[PDB]
Amino acid sequence: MVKVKFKYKGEEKEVDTSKIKKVWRVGKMVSFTYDDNGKTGRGAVSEKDAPKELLDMLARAER
User: What does UniProt give as the signal peptide span?
Assistant: First the structure.
């Protein structure tokens, strides 16, 4: 129930933490995939603007 607000190609978008599948660390940024209903979608936020739950998911994915 944590919401990640991200800009994709100049369009403001929002995806809940529960919908996110893959999270990666790319430089200063957190790039990710989520499940927009049947399809998969992609987005990214900077690590500075990221909510705590997203960053915890990132750390989990780095084991």
Answer: none
Give the resolution in Å.
2.7
Nearest CA among 27, 37, 31 for reference residue 4: 31
> Could you give the domains of the chain?
1-63 (2.40.50.40)
Are 28 and 47 in contact by the 8 Å Cβ rule? The answer is yes
Method: X-ray
> What b-and-e string marks burial along 32-58, b requiring 16 or more CB atoms within 10 Å of the CB?
bbbeeeeeebebebeeeebeebbeebb
